[PDB]
Amino acid sequence: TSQVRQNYHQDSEAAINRQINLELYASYVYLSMSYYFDRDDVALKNFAKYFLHQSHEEREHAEKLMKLQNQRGGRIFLQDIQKPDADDWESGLNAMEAALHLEKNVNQSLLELHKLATDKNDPHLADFIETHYLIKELGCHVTNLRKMGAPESGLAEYLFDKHTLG
Amino acid sequence: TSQVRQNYHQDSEAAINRQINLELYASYVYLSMSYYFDRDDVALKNFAKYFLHQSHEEREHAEKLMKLQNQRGGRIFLQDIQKPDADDWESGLNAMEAALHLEKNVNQSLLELHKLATDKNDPHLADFIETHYLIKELGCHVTNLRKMGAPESGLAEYLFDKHTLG
Amino acid sequence: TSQVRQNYHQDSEAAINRQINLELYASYVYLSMSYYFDRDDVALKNFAKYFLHQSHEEREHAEKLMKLQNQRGGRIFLQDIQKPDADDWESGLNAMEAALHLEKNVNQSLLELHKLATDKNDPHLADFIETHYLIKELGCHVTNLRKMGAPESGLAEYLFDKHTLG
Amino acid sequence: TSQVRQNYHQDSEAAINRQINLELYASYVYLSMSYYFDRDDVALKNFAKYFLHQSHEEREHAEKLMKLQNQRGGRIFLQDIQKPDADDWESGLNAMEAALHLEKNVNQSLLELHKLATDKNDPHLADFIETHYLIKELGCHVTNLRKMGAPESGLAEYLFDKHTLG
Amino acid sequence: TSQVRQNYHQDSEAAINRQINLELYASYVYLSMSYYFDRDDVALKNFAKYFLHQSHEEREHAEKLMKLQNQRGGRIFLQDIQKPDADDWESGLNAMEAALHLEKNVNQSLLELHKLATDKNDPHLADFIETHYLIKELGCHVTNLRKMGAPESGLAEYLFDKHTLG
Amino acid sequence: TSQVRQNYHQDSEAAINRQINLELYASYVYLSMSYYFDRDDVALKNFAKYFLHQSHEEREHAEKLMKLQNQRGGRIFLQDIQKPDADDWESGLNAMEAALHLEKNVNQSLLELHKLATDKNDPHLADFIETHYLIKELGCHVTNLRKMGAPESGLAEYLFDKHTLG
């Protein structure tokens, strides 16, 4: 090629295709986590709308990644989206850790992306990718869930529902 | 099975899972066709902001099914989300006619859903596709693009962009 | 054929149109009666403003069906609007008795429509019609008037005009 | 017849009960013309707002007359309202021009009744005619389309649908 | 038959009189359930607001039918209103669970009233069922109390008394 | 048992409960009647919106007794709510006539409840009752109607609706 591209590598153009999927995955996942806490033998809305909100949130990420190609110049190639690993997320504490673990791999994907954003001397790519993500909050809640009665306390969670997910 | 269920001939619960996927696909394909029209060798923002905005709405077509599952008593099984057929489309009219067939499909599996539902005695289920699943539109856009010299008269597309999307 | 026709059967399409020549007949009837009461020599000034609104808000049914046909892919085939029965409407209940009578045939045709709307298994049709038009109220005007002494008492007349229809 | 009747010929009235039958027909035609442009294969919204609007405005045009009758101590004698004429109208251009002829006709009948007003010195009858009626505006559209590429250039009666009817 | 009665079976009516009396019983229980908690030896003001609030809504649900009955031209025939069933209800958990078993009952008598409608095609009757009824909320409640410790844990049905009924 | 019991006797307690089932019988009776006038073949809308109110504010007396009961340490032992005599309520005053005739037996009971409150020298019960429920208003209405010629003058009926019940 287009009249726009310049200093943009074919590798870099493939990676975003890769992330565009991975971030789309996470939306699928959190989506999957969101309605598990909406079903009655769990009944933990808030946990619901928390994950639905992280689901809408990574549902973007991509959507801004797709802007990043239709702007650096590349072409967006979309691949299927995968069903999640589980289907009964056991509990609040389990979920978060899973979310906890899902958000690392997502970020690992980017950490090597900037490592590709430097090896191909793309500063307009050596930006934008470093500041829209990151974990740790999803840590914490783990500690906040660990030290309580989770995932036993069912009581330790219905309280975590109000005073940290309200 | 669970505690809320009653008068929910499982057979339909299976199908509920299938719209979930279906409508998701819709939201995928519309996601596709949305960020092609942001491509710089197309640059048709409004066409984007339209498809970008049909994707979000057929997504919540599905979000507002996974709520119907839990509710009537069911259980939500997700599956992979397959890519669209392209992977990057042809023209506004081509995109338009596209959704047309697509929404005709996603509507086909619902009038195929009223039946089975309009039989297995689920007055509940009978009144949540009856309240808000409808396409007509598009079909009436298709017309507005053909008659104007689309999909070649690029001037037709660009004027359609500012007047029936602005 | 039409590009958005789907599950829309021809028996249906032709019976809609047969219903539009009813819903424009009453409008003409309610119009016919609205201005028998604007006559200087009975001059029930509300019964005039009442049946007027009725002819108005029963030319809106027939319109909403025209919005419907055109939305289901159909084609519209209007016919002559016959003229009501008789030009002198006598009095008050007798026209209220007329308007009752008239509403009931309009109801019975829609019941012949919906009964036809579940033979071809149309969800969209059968949900559109049933969410709108009924009747009763006039039932409680014929009574009142028959209960007060109408129509044969002129003081009964004017009072209901001035205390029910204001 | 009547006590209020005065200076009103037979003759004048009958000449009112046939201009009502006319103004009525015109709305029935404007209806037929407005919903023609509400189809899925025509797709002109502002055309469908226009004639529907003249539809009501002639509805009223016929009503004022009605009251004129009773005010004149007349007796309205309603006849059947005839269908069009046309179902396909069938382009933008070919519609107004059939309304122009439609409007040049109804006005032709105004003038005769008014000459009937001067042949009976019915001045309260004349001043009803020369207040809020007549054509032209259709004309200046008719020219506008032709000058634009109708009916050969759908892009014409499109851009006329938004630039003079929005 | 009655003048407004049309397309209404005996049979449908006498069913309404057996669904009225039922929604009626549905309120009485809630009262019995509200003021149970209004005791000095049970001490949950929020539960007490919550079944007294249901008690007010099922009564409305009962008034809604009366009105349809007559509106259908039916003749309401009231019966005794039977008593609970229970005076000690006799914890938070156990109250909910009998409210769930209760709501499933009255909904059962809806679904068979609805199917009653289909076996005659009574579409005005049918739209009164699928608009403003059903449970779930009681489902999604019972779980929470269970998971928290109820009835083995007054500290739970206390805590649930604020954090989901404040 | 009880810990807030003191100077509350068991003739009292068992007479309070007896009084609630009185005051719920009134509600049921007013409710049987409100939707009597809602019948198409009487339709005195205000008679319906009044007695409907009476059935409220006499379903609210009974509730004000349960709060009292539980306050004074007691227990609530509700019973079957017997049904009103006759489903057809004749006319306007006949319903009014009954309506007084029925207040005179809730008051008569209360007056019998009070004499029990001084013979056991209760102040808090003897003050709560004498500051709430009385009668006569209806007394004036039975007269007005009988003065006008009710019920037998349907015109005396409907006016009283409009000028006194509105």
JSON list of C-alpha atoms in Angstrom, two decimals, chain D residues 89-145:
[
{"chain": "D", "resi": 89, "resn": "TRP", "atom": "CA", "xyz": [-45.97, 4.46, -9.61]},
{"chain": "D", "resi": 90, "resn": "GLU", "atom": "CA", "xyz": [-43.07, 3.57, -10.33]},
{"chain": "D", "resi": 91, "resn": "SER", "atom": "CA", "xyz": [-40.02, 5.78, -10.23]},
{"chain": "D", "resi": 92, "resn": "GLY", "atom": "CA", "xyz": [-39.53, 8.97, -8.32]},
{"chain": "D", "resi": 93, "resn": "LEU", "atom": "CA", "xyz": [-40.17, 11.12, -11.36]},
{"chain": "D", "resi": 94, "resn": "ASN", "atom": "CA", "xyz": [-43.17, 9.21, -12.65]},
{"chain": "D", "resi": 95, "resn": "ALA", "atom": "CA", "xyz": [-44.87, 9.76, -9.31]},
{"chain": "D", "resi": 96, "resn": "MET", "atom": "CA", "xyz": [-44.97, 13.53, -8.78]},
{"chain": "D", "resi": 97, "resn": "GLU", "atom": "CA", "xyz": [-46.09, 13.99, -12.38]},
{"chain": "D", "resi": 98, "resn": "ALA", "atom": "CA", "xyz": [-49.03, 11.73, -11.66]},
{"chain": "D", "resi": 99, "resn": "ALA", "atom": "CA", "xyz": [-49.70, 13.81, -8.59]},
{"chain": "D", "resi": 100, "resn": "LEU", "atom": "CA", "xyz": [-49.39, 17.02, -10.59]},
{"chain": "D", "resi": 101, "resn": "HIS", "atom": "CA", "xyz": [-52.10, 15.74, -12.89]},
{"chain": "D", "resi": 102, "resn": "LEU", "atom": "CA", "xyz": [-53.83, 14.57, -9.73]},
{"chain": "D", "resi": 103, "resn": "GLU", "atom": "CA", "xyz": [-53.58, 18.07, -8.30]},
{"chain": "D", "resi": 104, "resn": "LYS", "atom": "CA", "xyz": [-54.46, 19.91, -11.49]},
{"chain": "D", "resi": 105, "resn": "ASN", "atom": "CA", "xyz": [-57.64, 17.84, -11.52]},
{"chain": "D", "resi": 106, "resn": "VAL", "atom": "CA", "xyz": [-58.84, 18.44, -7.99]},
{"chain": "D", "resi": 107, "resn": "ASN", "atom": "CA", "xyz": [-58.19, 22.11, -8.44]},
{"chain": "D", "resi": 108, "resn": "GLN", "atom": "CA", "xyz": [-60.17, 21.98, -11.67]},
{"chain": "D", "resi": 109, "resn": "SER", "atom": "CA", "xyz": [-63.09, 21.01, -9.46]},
{"chain": "D", "resi": 110, "resn": "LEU", "atom": "CA", "xyz": [-62.47, 23.70, -6.92]},
{"chain": "D", "resi": 111, "resn": "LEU", "atom": "CA", "xyz": [-62.82, 26.28, -9.69]},
{"chain": "D", "resi": 112, "resn": "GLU", "atom": "CA", "xyz": [-66.10, 24.88, -10.96]},
{"chain": "D", "resi": 113, "resn": "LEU", "atom": "CA", "xyz": [-67.69, 24.84, -7.55]},
{"chain": "D", "resi": 114, "resn": "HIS", "atom": "CA", "xyz": [-66.42, 28.34, -6.98]},
{"chain": "D", "resi": 115, "resn": "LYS", "atom": "CA", "xyz": [-67.94, 29.46, -10.24]},
{"chain": "D", "resi": 116, "resn": "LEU", "atom": "CA", "xyz": [-70.95, 27.71, -8.85]},
{"chain": "D", "resi": 117, "resn": "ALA", "atom": "CA", "xyz": [-70.47, 30.02, -5.87]},
{"chain": "D", "resi": 118, "resn": "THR", "atom": "CA", "xyz": [-70.65, 33.14, -8.04]},
{"chain": "D", "resi": 119, "resn": "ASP", "atom": "CA", "xyz": [-73.64, 31.79, -9.97]},
{"chain": "D", "resi": 120, "resn": "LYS", "atom": "CA", "xyz": [-75.51, 31.63, -6.67]},
{"chain": "D", "resi": 121, "resn": "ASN", "atom": "CA", "xyz": [-73.80, 34.49, -4.79]},
{"chain": "D", "resi": 122, "resn": "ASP", "atom": "CA", "xyz": [-72.68, 32.19, -1.96]},
{"chain": "D", "resi": 123, "resn": "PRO", "atom": "CA", "xyz": [-69.85, 34.25, -0.61]},
{"chain": "D", "resi": 124, "resn": "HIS", "atom": "CA", "xyz": [-69.26, 32.25, 2.48]},
{"chain": "D", "resi": 125, "resn": "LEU", "atom": "CA", "xyz": [-68.96, 29.40, 0.03]},
{"chain": "D", "resi": 126, "resn": "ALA", "atom": "CA", "xyz": [-66.43, 31.21, -2.12]},
{"chain": "D", "resi": 127, "resn": "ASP", "atom": "CA", "xyz": [-64.12, 32.32, 0.65]},
{"chain": "D", "resi": 128, "resn": "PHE", "atom": "CA", "xyz": [-63.62, 28.73, 1.63]},
{"chain": "D", "resi": 129, "resn": "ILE", "atom": "CA", "xyz": [-62.00, 27.88, -1.67]},
{"chain": "D", "resi": 130, "resn": "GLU", "atom": "CA", "xyz": [-59.46, 30.71, -1.99]},
{"chain": "D", "resi": 131, "resn": "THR", "atom": "CA", "xyz": [-57.56, 30.25, 1.27]},
{"chain": "D", "resi": 132, "resn": "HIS", "atom": "CA", "xyz": [-55.46, 27.07, 1.70]},
{"chain": "D", "resi": 133, "resn": "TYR", "atom": "CA", "xyz": [-55.18, 25.01, -1.54]},
{"chain": "D", "resi": 134, "resn": "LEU", "atom": "CA", "xyz": [-53.42, 24.22, -4.83]},
{"chain": "D", "resi": 135, "resn": "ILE", "atom": "CA", "xyz": [-50.42, 22.89, -6.81]},
{"chain": "D", "resi": 136, "resn": "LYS", "atom": "CA", "xyz": [-47.09, 24.27, -8.11]},
{"chain": "D", "resi": 137, "resn": "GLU", "atom": "CA", "xyz": [-44.79, 22.62, -5.54]},
{"chain": "D", "resi": 138, "resn": "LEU", "atom": "CA", "xyz": [-45.12, 19.29, -7.31]},
{"chain": "D", "resi": 139, "resn": "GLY", "atom": "CA", "xyz": [-44.24, 21.14, -10.48]},
{"chain": "D", "resi": 140, "resn": "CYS", "atom": "CA", "xyz": [-41.06, 22.56, -9.19]},
{"chain": "D", "resi": 141, "resn": "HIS", "atom": "CA", "xyz": [-40.00, 19.10, -8.12]},
{"chain": "D", "resi": 142, "resn": "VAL", "atom": "CA", "xyz": [-40.98, 17.52, -11.46]},
{"chain": "D", "resi": 143, "resn": "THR", "atom": "CA", "xyz": [-38.59, 19.88, -13.16]},
{"chain": "D", "resi": 144, "resn": "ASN", "atom": "CA", "xyz": [-35.94, 19.24, -10.51]},
{"chain": "D", "resi": 145, "resn": "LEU", "atom": "CA", "xyz": [-35.74, 15.52, -11.13]}
]
